[PDB]
From a paper:
Here we describe the molecular basis of the reaction mechanism and dual NADH/NADPH-specificity of D2HDH, a 2-hydroxyacid dehydrogenase from the extreme halophile Haloferax mediterranei, an organism whose proteins have to remain active in high intracellular concentrations of KCl. Sequence analysis has identified D2HDH as a member of the DDH clade of the D-isomer specific 2-hydroxyacid dehydrogenase enzyme family (2HADH), which has potential applications in the synthesis of chiral fine chemicals including alcohols, and hydroxy or amino acids from ketones or ketoacids. Structural studies have shown that all members of this family share a common fold based on two domains, which cycle between open and closed conformational states that serve to close the inter-domain cleft, bringing the substrates together during catalysis. The D2HDH dimer has an overall ellipsoidal appearance in which each monomer is folded into two domains (d1; residues 1–92 and 283–308 and d2; residues 93–282).
Given the presence of a chloride ion in the structure of the D2HDH/NAD+/-2-ketohexanoic acid complex at the 2’ phosphate binding site of NADP+, the decrease in the NADPH-dependent activity of the enzyme at high concentrations of KCl was consistent with the Cl- ion competing with the 2’ phosphate for the same binding site on the protein. Comparing the two structures movements of up to 1.5 Å in the residues of the Arg 165-Val 171 loop, that lies adjacent to the 2’ hydroxyl or 2’ phosphate groups of the two nucleotides, occur. Compared to the loss in activity seen with NADPH at high KCl concentrations, the absence of any similar reduction with NADH is consistent with the independent binding sites for the chloride ion and the 2’ ribose hydroxyl of NADH. At low KCl concentrations the predominant species would be a NADH/enzyme complex, but as the KCl concentration rises, the binding of Cl- at the 2’ phosphate site would increase, to give a NADH/Cl- D2HDH complex which would mimic that of the NADPH enzyme. Three well defined Na+ binding sites per subunit could be confidently assigned, two of which were in common with sites 1 and 3 in the K+ structure. This is possible because the protein ligands in these two sites are clustered together in such a way as to permit the Na+ ion to move closer to them to accommodate its smaller ionic radius, whilst allowing associated differences in the water structure.
Author numbering:
A (entry chain A), B (entry chain B): 1 to 308
The structure:
Amino acid sequence: MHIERLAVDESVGRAMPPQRFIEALSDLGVPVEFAGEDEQFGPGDAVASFGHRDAFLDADWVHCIRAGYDEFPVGVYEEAGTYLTNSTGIHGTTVGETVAGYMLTFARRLHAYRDAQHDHAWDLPRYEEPFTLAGERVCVVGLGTLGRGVVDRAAALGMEVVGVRRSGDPVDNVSTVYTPDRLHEAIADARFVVLATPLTDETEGMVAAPEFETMREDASLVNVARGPVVVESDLVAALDSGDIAGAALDVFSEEPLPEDSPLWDFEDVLITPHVSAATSKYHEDVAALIRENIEKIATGDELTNRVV
Amino acid sequence: MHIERLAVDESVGRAMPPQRFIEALSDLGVPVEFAGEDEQFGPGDAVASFGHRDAFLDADWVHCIRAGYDEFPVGVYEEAGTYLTNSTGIHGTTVGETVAGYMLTFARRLHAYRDAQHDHAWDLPRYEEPFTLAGERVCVVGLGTLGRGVVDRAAALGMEVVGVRRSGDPVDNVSTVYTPDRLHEAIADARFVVLATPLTDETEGMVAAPEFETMREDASLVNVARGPVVVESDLVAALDSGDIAGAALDVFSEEPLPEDSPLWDFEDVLITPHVSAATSKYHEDVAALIRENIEKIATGDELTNRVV
Ligand SMILES: NC(=O)c1ccc[n+]([C@@H]2O[C@H](COP(=O)([O-])OP(=O)(O)OC[C@H]3O[C@@H](n4cnc5c(N)ncnc54)[C@H](O)[C@@H]3O)[C@@H](O)[C@H]2O)c1
Ligand SMILES: NC(=O)c1ccc[n+]([C@@H]2O[C@H](COP(=O)([O-])OP(=O)(O)OC[C@H]3O[C@@H](n4cnc5c(N)ncnc54)[C@H](O)[C@@H]3O)[C@@H](O)[C@H]2O)c1
Ligand SMILES: [Cl-]
Ligand SMILES: [Cl-]
Ligand SMILES: [Mg+2]
Ligand SMILES: [Mg+2]
Ligand SMILES: [Mg+2]
Ligand SMILES: [Mg+2]
Ligand SMILES: [Mg+2]
Ligand SMILES: [Mg+2]
Ligand SMILES: [Mg+2]
Ligand SMILES: [Mg+2]
Ligand SMILES: [Mg+2]
Ligand SMILES: [Mg+2]
Ligand code: NA
Ligand code: NA
Ligand code: NA
Ligand code: NA
Ligand code: NA
Ligand code: NA
């Protein structure tokens, strides 16, 4: 096909300033322009956006600036003949680092020390509290971009790494790969269980009371996927009961996390506001995907990360 | 003529429960006995201690359970004929992990999110705040056990690593090493400056107003060495002025850090209570060194980590 301009929907501001992205693409080979929420599109238009608007169905191509596309109506794009791509592939370093940071925070007790800092308290941990990630086990559920970003960093810190993916096939830096059939075996002996799957009707509610029972009482859950992969109320009950020790949570069933959620108040819960992938260079990272697909369009090659 | 007993001074409790350590020393071939602060010593005694007591100068050998021995009067041990060893070599994984945790905390803004957690605030970072360690520069000052623990993990996370040591000679995972006379060159372009030297006459007050001026305004100091390597009042002044952005501090010129230190109150300072090396297995890690040196002394070999 033939792209005549890239419209940058104002919604991209949920992850990056639109002007930074626009200017980053000054040499793309088609003009790039800010688009407000009430604009119309037509033949030749590509649109980069955070979320979906029905107006985009008059464009030739929509690039979702997120990895997760579970809030796009994929069926309506098919019918309109509008291509849809996502941003999978670009979040491995940011998420991987964040998750390494969560794990090190728990091992080295940094969050407890931060709490004490507010009170000007020189508070020493219990002797049994501080440990090293070296030699501890992590299970990574989902072994795509996010999961591999986590795996690589965990392995380099000397962790024992296992994980779960649909094929069960070997993955670089993972000692043992399990199919989803064997989730309970995969999580049972892990100090950390990390969720890195898309939200689909197959992964929704995957981690609930029975999984928390299976998990070690000294283990922590990490959710950087989507909130509804966990049954949130079961997680609260598990934390209350001591079925698991704690959790690092970047995503929730309702975001922003409501103020009356019990999750805020657990010492060994870390709440982060859907920012495990945040980066001051997100504009460059998304721009690279746009450049790639503009080359594919020019040459008549299949688009990267095409959803429909 | 042999070591006939190992006394465990009560001061070891500053780091680990004494009876955990005593029980870890059950293999040794000499009895292991708790010693209170009024114990007398004599020929054939070895003593494991946190700090110095003049009573130890009647013993044959003191093992300091810390890496840093700056609080010991090394001069008087020589005249008394008492050997003195330290615990250098066992803190690379713990401190390396803690420092990686500090740097990831700053990059990923985890400390800011923890502050917000207390307020149930879903506070989003400014676009420029979150970054990745990958591609950022760290300068590690001191390239022994602690500094190489730091370096190896920084390198594995994709950082650019430079550093300083007395000889200025190469070190694995350090792309450029500088002599101490080139400290300002080493630190000038670093996003993180990590201190990992002993406290000596040479290093006391190494990092002061001129060093904070040279450092990038966006840089963070990490001190896991000893407080007095920094001129603490100059660090406060630099943070007030914005000469640097912040700091992760495990050690202080007075410990416990007084409740009225200005350092508690900076958002981008992390205070930790001299616990970057804390570990639930410290008793095992130190016992290994004791076993090693009991065997060295028994056989007439040079002692490991002999100071005097
Ligand atoms: N928190 C954040 O800011 C953030 C950032 C990016 C992505 N995400 C979320 O993470 C998801 C994954 O992103 P990605 O870029 O790694 O995608 P990806 O397509 O590269 O990887 C997905 C992986 O999940 C696996 N998977 C699917 N169903 C599974 C199941 N039932 N059990 C186990 N594994 C299963 C796949 O087989 C693959 O290994 C996104 O869909 C999005 O929801 C969150
Ligand atoms: N925070 C903690 O809990 C904790 C734990 C262990 C050690 N420490 C401190 O860290 C210090 C270092 O321990 P280590 O085991 O790494 O010691 P080490 O002897 O293995 O290494 C010391 C390093 O510092 C370097 N150094 C000395 N003078 C220097 C100078 N003027 N400029 C630059 N580099 C210089 C040496 O060349 C060497 O590379 C200890 O003496 C102790 O004070 C703190
Ligand atoms: Cl797969
Ligand atoms: Cl040296
Ligand atoms: Mg508006
Ligand atoms: Mg506690
Ligand atoms: Mg189940
Ligand atoms: Mg608990
Ligand atoms: Mg609360
Ligand atoms: Mg702020
Ligand atoms: Mg100077
Ligand atoms: Mg500033
Ligand atoms: Mg205060
Ligand atoms: Mg020998
Ligand atoms: Na991917
Ligand atoms: Na460990
Ligand atoms: Na459990
Ligand atoms: Na050493
Ligand atoms: Na970076
Ligand atoms: Na400066």
